[PDB]
Design a protein around this motif. Structure first.
Motif, mmCIF file in Angstrom:
data_model
loop_
_atom_site.group_PDB
_atom_site.id
_atom_site.type_symbol
_atom_site.label_atom_id
_atom_site.label_comp_id
_atom_site.label_asym_id
_atom_site.label_seq_id
_atom_site.Cartn_x
_atom_site.Cartn_y
_atom_site.Cartn_z
ATOM 1 N N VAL A 116 -72.973 -26.553 -53.142
ATOM 2 C CA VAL A 116 -73.337 -27.175 -54.383
ATOM 3 C C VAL A 116 -72.256 -27.032 -55.475
ATOM 4 N N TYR A 117 -71.012 -26.879 -55.023
ATOM 5 C CA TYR A 117 -69.834 -26.631 -55.855
ATOM 6 C C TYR A 117 -69.215 -27.952 -56.321
ATOM 7 N N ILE A 118 -69.075 -28.100 -57.640
ATOM 8 C CA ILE A 118 -68.469 -29.305 -58.184
ATOM 9 C C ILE A 118 -66.969 -29.210 -57.953
ATOM 10 N N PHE A 136 -60.332 -29.689 -59.682
ATOM 11 C CA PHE A 136 -59.983 -28.286 -59.919
ATOM 12 C C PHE A 136 -58.738 -27.882 -59.143
ATOM 13 N N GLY A 142 -62.221 -23.919 -60.447
ATOM 14 C CA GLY A 142 -63.568 -24.209 -60.901
ATOM 15 C C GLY A 142 -64.509 -23.030 -61.014
ATOM 16 N N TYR A 163 -66.241 -19.675 -62.780
ATOM 17 C CA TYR A 163 -66.648 -19.351 -64.139
ATOM 18 C C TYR A 163 -65.608 -18.534 -64.898
ATOM 19 N N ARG A 205 -80.106 -25.051 -58.082
ATOM 20 C CA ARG A 205 -80.263 -23.783 -57.344
ATOM 21 C C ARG A 205 -81.501 -22.988 -57.726
HETATM 22 N N1 LIG Z 1 -67.277 -26.188 -59.713
HETATM 23 C C1 LIG Z 1 -68.238 -25.253 -59.768
HETATM 24 N N2 LIG Z 1 -67.874 -24.054 -60.282
HETATM 25 C C2 LIG Z 1 -68.775 -23.070 -60.374
HETATM 26 N N3 LIG Z 1 -68.625 -21.829 -60.847
HETATM 27 C C3 LIG Z 1 -69.843 -21.249 -60.712
HETATM 28 N N4 LIG Z 1 -70.756 -22.100 -60.167
HETATM 29 C C4 LIG Z 1 -70.149 -23.265 -59.925
HETATM 30 C C5 LIG Z 1 -70.472 -24.607 -59.374
HETATM 31 O O1 LIG Z 1 -71.609 -24.876 -58.973
HETATM 32 N N5 LIG Z 1 -69.490 -25.532 -59.330
#
Ligand SMILES: Nc1nc2[nH]cnc2c(=O)[nH]1
Ligand SMILES: *[C@@H]1O[C@H](CO)[C@@H](O[C@@H]2O[C@H](CO)[C@@H](O)[C@H](O)[C@H]2NC(C)=O)[C@H](O)[C@H]1NC(C)=O
Lengths: 246, 6
Positions: A69-71, A83, A109, A111, A163
């Protein structure tokens, strides 16, 4: 694909979008009744496209890795943005190929990096639907510093809400007024990988976590999660990161 | 499972 329109948005339409987002993520298995995200997906199928529209109807498309689920990046008109990380570079191989130019953002990407680029921790950045409108608008034209903050808002209002039901509800409460995330919200975001792991390890440990997860609750108190009977597990968490990816 | 604000 999934879509969300801020024009006319309310807690209900936002709830529908988060439902759509969750349902777009494939799974073969549920673990303690929670969908277990796949270990891997090959090719373009790895990436979900999210179409987000600001109040004025301008749009970006966000690429999301369906396994975690990572952008990875996004498209804003004719420019793609990714990123600065191997996973995002890989994504650029499959999505938004028809952009006239591709910009690599000057941060990864995660935090920690995003907070550094933005000059603010998440604890200080208001989130909500208005904030999401702002974020879409910011991302429409390149500004790396502004984009870091926009991306922190975007991640929390989409992926983190997907999530955790608690986080979805928190954004719903912020439909017409932004507010900084609760300490519980931050706790949950920080604990998703840990929780996913322990819930999976519990399967052959009688529902008991091999290692307890320390969380902050809604009242701001510091609870400890030790087994699958926890409200976190029975009601809150909505997707599990596969242990193969931990 | 908990809720509001913060
Ligand atoms: N791109 C991205 N960065 C994060 N950093 C923490 N959670 C996420 C996420 O879901 N996507
Ligand atoms: C499984 O988790 C529950 C908490 O969700 C544990 O029960 C709680 O913990 C103590 C009592 O031992 C109290 O502080 C809580 O109020 C309890 N809550 C409830 C609803 O029972 C339980 O002890 C854990 N079980 C195992 C085997 O680890």
């Amino acid at each position: 694909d999934v879509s969300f329109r801020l024009s006319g948005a309310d807690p209900s339409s936002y709830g529908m979008f988060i439902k759509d987002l969750r349902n777009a993520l494939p799974h073969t298995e549920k673990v303690y009744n929670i969908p277990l995200l796949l270990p891997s997906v090959s090719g373009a199928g790895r990436y979900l496209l999210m179409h987000l529209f600001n109040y004025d109807g301008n749009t970006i498309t966000v690429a999301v890795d369906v396994t975690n689920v990572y952008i990875m990046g996004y498209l804003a008109l004719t420019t793609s943005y990714f990123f600065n990380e191997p996973a995002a570079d890989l994504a650029s191989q499959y999505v938004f190929r028809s952009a006239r130019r591709k910009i690599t953002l000057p941060y990864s990407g995660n935090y920690e990096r995003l907070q550094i680029a933005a000059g603010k921790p998440r604890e200080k950045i208001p989130i909500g639907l208005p904030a999401l409108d702002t974020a879409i608008s910011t991302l429409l034209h390149y500004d790396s510093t502004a984009a870091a903050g926009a991306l922190l808002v975007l991640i929390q209002t989409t992926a983190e809400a997907a999530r955790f039901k608690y986080i979805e509800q928190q954004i719903q409460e912020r439909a017409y007024r932004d507010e900084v995330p609760s300490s519980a919200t931050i706790s949950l975001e920080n604990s998703w990988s840990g929780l996913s792991k322990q819930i999976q390890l519990a399967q052959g440990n009688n529902g008991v976590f091999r290692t307890p997860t320390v969380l902050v609750d809604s009242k701001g108190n510091r609870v400890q999660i030790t087994n699958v009977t926890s409200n976190v597990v029975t009601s809150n968490i909505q997707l599990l990161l596969n242990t193969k990816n931990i | 499972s908990d809720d509001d604000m913060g």
